[PDB]
Design goal:
2 copies of one chain form a homodimer.
Chain A: H1 7-17, E1 21-25, H2 31-43, E2 47-51, H3 63-68, E3 73-78, E4 90-94, H4 101-106, H5 109-113, E5 118-123, H6 131-140, E6 144-146, E7 175-178, H7 183-192, E8 196-199, E9 206-208, H8 212-225, E10 230-236, H9 244-256, E11 260-266, E12 281-284, H10 289-292, E13 300-301, H11 303-309, E14 335-337
Parallel strand pairs in A: 1-2, 1-3, 3-4, 5-6, 5-7, 7-8, 10-11, 10-12, 12-13
Antiparallel strand pairs in A: 4-14, 8-9
Helix pairs in contact in A: 8-11
PDB class: biosynthetic protein
Keywords: Diphthamide biosynthesis, radical SAM enzyme, gene triplication, biosynthetic protein
Assembly: dimeric
């Protein structure tokens, strides 16, 4: 149950823009929402194309596609804006979960107290609108609450992304993560070297994160790759994912240590498509989620990991795509940007 | 010369261009050859990137991608040029199979005679260089051989593509097809309604194509869509597959006949990506191989545009959906070509 799509506000925005034809991208959970929204906008004399790709982030706006098919503007359902060049005017429609964060915290006060007095609090987009309540509740429980602004890849203070934990690079004794899954909490534990407690607002369940099992698991992939001679080094052309210079660097670095390395260019980074190439191992220089989150035949490493493989790095490190300083914050609802 | 990758010629055309960084596209069977060529070119001071996607035709050059990552040119392995605008100079490197086709013809000369005196001869790209021998042989046995030039999506006279049988639209009693597999000769028969005899040059086996089983399958699929009210109308942004105006027509048509219709824009067209959408049936206006050659992956009724018109009761007889080009002024070489726009 999400906060409902603001069809009205959206339409008012197109009207202003003087947009006649639009493309709508949507994530897996919002497909039916996407069409419903389309019918409505066509009822009001606007032509709507739907994007057929399942979208996974604002790091991947379908603006170039919009341009190609002659669209005036892009609607991006389900995510907030991260700083990118956009080729047509784009309306972002953050989706906010309705579930009560504070109820989930109230059931777990005792666990949260094991974190310390001054704590760092983090969450995901789906809960960012209740972070102020969550902070006020925690302060009313005796905690000092530390929340980081984050960099240009982040939309709001306290928000973490799979590739980015800059909001957690602040002073504090322990880290509270509000949301589901163990990937972010794990990412936080490794990136900060702090104790991490994760609370799932849906289930009210909690997890104390231990990164050592993960780090050991990664080290076995690094070990397998120790004897590899031939590497493929992968980039993604997604607007917010391309990391050419870094991939070039990794290529040069593997060669200098007597390996062969070839840069490979993809869109969706997908092991399957690579099975015929002659390479013995892979380095993904895109979004950390791909390799870290373990079913590929050959080893696949992040750029940090390959630095360890070549013994130019000693401690394990999570791969993050960092942004630049962020001027202001995004709104808790619709926003529109253009270039 | 002709049957392996001409590293030196490729290197020579890159030099002439002044290309210092190239992107190499390859299909499934040439993944290893792609990297061997990359290694060779890098030994010669050209920076090489590989395209990680799996390519399925010259209708989908990775020239925009080449541009985005700073490449001077694109190498396109395994296919020959079809008329498209290109953002970087592109070297095409078509694949030519080695098998001599005549032996298989000699074996089956009897069956070929049942096509009549004047016959239409067709093949696929990988035997195109053998077409001259085949013609000379058939004539020496008394046939009259007609070979169509085909339109701008075809690279050589006599060559068929899965979505284009234009080389077959010429005067002739019956059609001979030299090659393997069932999709092409079946496409020929459906698209020309003429007698088609298929001969595989490897096995020397022959087959007379009966499209009855295929067309009946297509009526069934149309039957299933007769109930649908919500329609997804699909285009692909691959350079040589983008049929926007025709997709818009089909949307307008569907609505005009009471159905709901939405235009959906993809790159690679496949059902799984569409599973969460509300539509009860789909129209693919792109590469007809998708709906016409589905092994079973589409769990909702998926149609070609031709088949939509039949459903709304605007057609009476089945027609194969082809992607057609315009007049082609010249022919591609039997070897590498290089093309540009910008």
């Amino acid at each position: 149950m999400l906060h409902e799509i603001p069809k009205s506000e959206i339409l008012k925005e197109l009207k202003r823009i003087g947009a006649k034809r639009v493309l709508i991208q949507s994530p897996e959970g919002l497909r039916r929402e996407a069409e419903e929204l389309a019918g409505f906008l066509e009822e009001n004399n606007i032509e709507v194309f739907l994007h057929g790709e399942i979208n996974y982030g604002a790091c991947d706006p379908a603006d170039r596609e919009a341009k190609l098919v002659g669209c005036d503007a892009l609607i991006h359902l389900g995510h907030s804006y991260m700083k990118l060049p956009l080729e047509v005017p784009t309306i972002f429609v953050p989706a906010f979960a309705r579930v009560s964060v504070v109820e989930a915290l109230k059931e777990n006060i005792g666990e949260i107290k094991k974190l310390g007095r001054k704590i760092i609090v983090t969450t995901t987009a789906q809960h960012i609108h209740q972070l102020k309540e969550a902070k006020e509740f925690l302060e009313s429980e005796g905690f000092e609450v530390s929340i980081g602004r984050g960099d240009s890849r982040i939309s709001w203070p306290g928000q973490v992304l799979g590739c980015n934990y800059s909001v957690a690079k602040v002073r504090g004794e322990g880290i509270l993560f509000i949301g589901s899954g163990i990937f972010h909490p794990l990412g936080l534990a490794v990136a900060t070297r702090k104790k991490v407690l994760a609370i799932d607002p849906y289930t009210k369940a909690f997890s104390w994160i231990d990164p050592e099992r993960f780090i050991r698991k990664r080290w076995a992939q690094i070990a397998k790759a120790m004897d590899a001679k031939k590497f493929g080094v992968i980039v993604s052309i997604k607007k917010g994912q391309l990391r050419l210079a870094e991939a070039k660097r990794i290529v040069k670095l593997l060669k200098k240590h007597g390996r062969e390395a070839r840069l490979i260019v993809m869109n969706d980074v997908n092991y399957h498509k690579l099975e015929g190439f002659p390479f013995e191992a892979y380095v993904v220089v895109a979004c950390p989620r791909v390799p870290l989150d373990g079913a590929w035949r050959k080893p696949v490493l992040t750029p940090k990991e390959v630095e360890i493989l070549l013994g130019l790095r000693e401690e394990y490190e999570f791969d993050e795509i960092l942004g630049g300083p962020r001027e202001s914050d995004e709104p808790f609802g619709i926003s529109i940007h253009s270039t």
